[PDB]
Amino acid sequence: QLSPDIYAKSCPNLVQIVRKQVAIALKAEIRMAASLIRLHFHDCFVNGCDASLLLDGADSEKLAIPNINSARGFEVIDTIKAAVENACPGVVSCADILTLAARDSVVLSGGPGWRVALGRKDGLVANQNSANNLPSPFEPLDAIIAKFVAVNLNITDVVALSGAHTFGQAKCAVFSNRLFNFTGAGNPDATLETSLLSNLQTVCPLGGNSNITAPLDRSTTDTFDNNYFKNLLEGKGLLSSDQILFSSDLAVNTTKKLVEAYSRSQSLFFRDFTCAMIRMGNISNGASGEVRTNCRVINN
Numbered sequence: 001q002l003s004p005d006i007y008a009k010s011c012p013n014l015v016q017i018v019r020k021q022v023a024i025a026l027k028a029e030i031r032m033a034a035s036l037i038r039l040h041f042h043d044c045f046v047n048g049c050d051a052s053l054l055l056d057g058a059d060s061e062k063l064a065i066p067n068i069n070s071a072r073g074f075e076v077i078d079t080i081k082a083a084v085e086n087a088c089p090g091v092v093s094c095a096d097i098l099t100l101a102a103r104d105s106v107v108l109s110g111g112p113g114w115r116v117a118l119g120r121k122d123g124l125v126a127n128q129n130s131a132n133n134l135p136s137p138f139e140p141l142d143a144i145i146a147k148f149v150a151v152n153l154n155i156t157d158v159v160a161l162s163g164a165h166t167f168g169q170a171k172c173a174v175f176s177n178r179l180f181n182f183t184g185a186g187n188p189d190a191t192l193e194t195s196l197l198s199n200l201q202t203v204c205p206l207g208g209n210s211n212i213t214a215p216l217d218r219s220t221t222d223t224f225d226n227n228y229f230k231n232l233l234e235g236k237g238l239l240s241s242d243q244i245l246f247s248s249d250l251a252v253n254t255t256k257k258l259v260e261a262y263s264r265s266q267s268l269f270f271r272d273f274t275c276a277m278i279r280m281g282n283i284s285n286g287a288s289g290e291v292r293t294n295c296r297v298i299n300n
């Protein structure tokens with residue numbers, strides 16, 4: 001049972017300590033705000049929000065197909081954790097720190113804030129197999145929805161949480177297939193607006209460095225706002241998994257209207273986003289855990 005005051009006696013200043021450290025990280029690299037919330041997402045969708053993703057090793061989740069050469073911000077988490085451990089030795093879990101850092105990243109980026117409930121335990125093992133099953137930018141909308149349903153989330157959560165792509169980057173490798181010969185017909189993805197198509201072809205030329213990135217949100221790259229959804233109405237979503245929320249056949253009577261509603265009301269988007277984040281932060285696999293003192297390895 002989570003509670004915002006679970007550390008009221010054991011670590012009174014936790015919230016402030018984490019906030020100050022997140023602000024320091026964002027000052028050094030603004031993209032880190034995006035990277036941190038993505039870590040929380042990838043943590044919660046595998047063995048629950050138990051910091052299993054932070055564990056190193058030959059069988060680490062960091063090597064899973066969706067995480068390798070992709071997930072980032074591990075050094076920043078170590079720094080935050082070190083500050084918290086200096087202030088309250090062996091008290092706060094890495095799982096909670098990741099949750100708080102995600103919330104702070106949204107807030108410091110102009111997004112909505114919410115009171116985080118604490119008390120999560122850190123897992124004892126990595127689940128690389130499950131991490132390979134994380135949502136893919138290449139799969140159909142129904143497949144993405146099924147992955148959210150599997151962890152007790154739903155369609156509304158899919159659309160609202162996809163809004164996190166209102167900031168951050170995505171490498172050429174996960175969207176360049178939409179730029180030249182998307183289906184074998186020799187044409188780019190027909191749902192991609194031509195001016196964006198032109199800019200992306202410049203960023204991702206055939207045979208070039210596929211690790212170069214482009215902003216997920218072409219209007220306000222670092223500001224957390226509903227501009228992500230406005231992009232979709234114009235066919236300017238970067239990943240196929242973004243644009244299908246508006247343009248796919250399945251979206252018509254499912255996600256399409258939600259995308260249009262968030263575009264009309266940022267307050268609505270912010271309300272649903274906070275709601276979905278809290279729900280995602282409540283995912284647990286019920287396995288035994290502990291308060292991990294070094295996020296990269298178990299205590300014993």
Ligand code: HEM
Pocket residue numbers: 031033034035036037038041069070071072135136137138144158161162164165167168169170171174213239241
């Ligand atoms: C709905 C299914 C989703 C898919 C298919 C997906 C896919 C992706 C992909 C392929 C990237 C680029 C990775 C890279 O460049 O290596 C990315 C980045 C990102 N995703 Fe998602 N994502 C999804 C959901 C979410 C959710 C639920 C959140 C968090 C609440 C999220 C937050 C992020 C952020 C903020 C970035 C930027 C990371 C950075 O710049 O370091 N994503 N996502």
Ligand SMILES: N[C@@H](CCC(=O)N[C@@H](CS)C(=O)NCC(=O)O)C(=O)O
Pocket residue numbers: 154156157272275276279
């Ligand atoms: N999914 C539940 C509702 C859960 C919920 O409250 N979801 C929030 C978003 S996080 C909402 O406003 N709508 C979701 C929904 O209607 O399912 C249901 O269908 O009764």
Ligand SMILES: [Ca+2]
Pocket residue numbers: 042043044045046047048049050051052053
């Ligand atoms: Ca996890």
Ligand SMILES: [Ca+2]
Pocket residue numbers: 166167217219220221222223224225227228
């Ligand atoms: Ca934005």
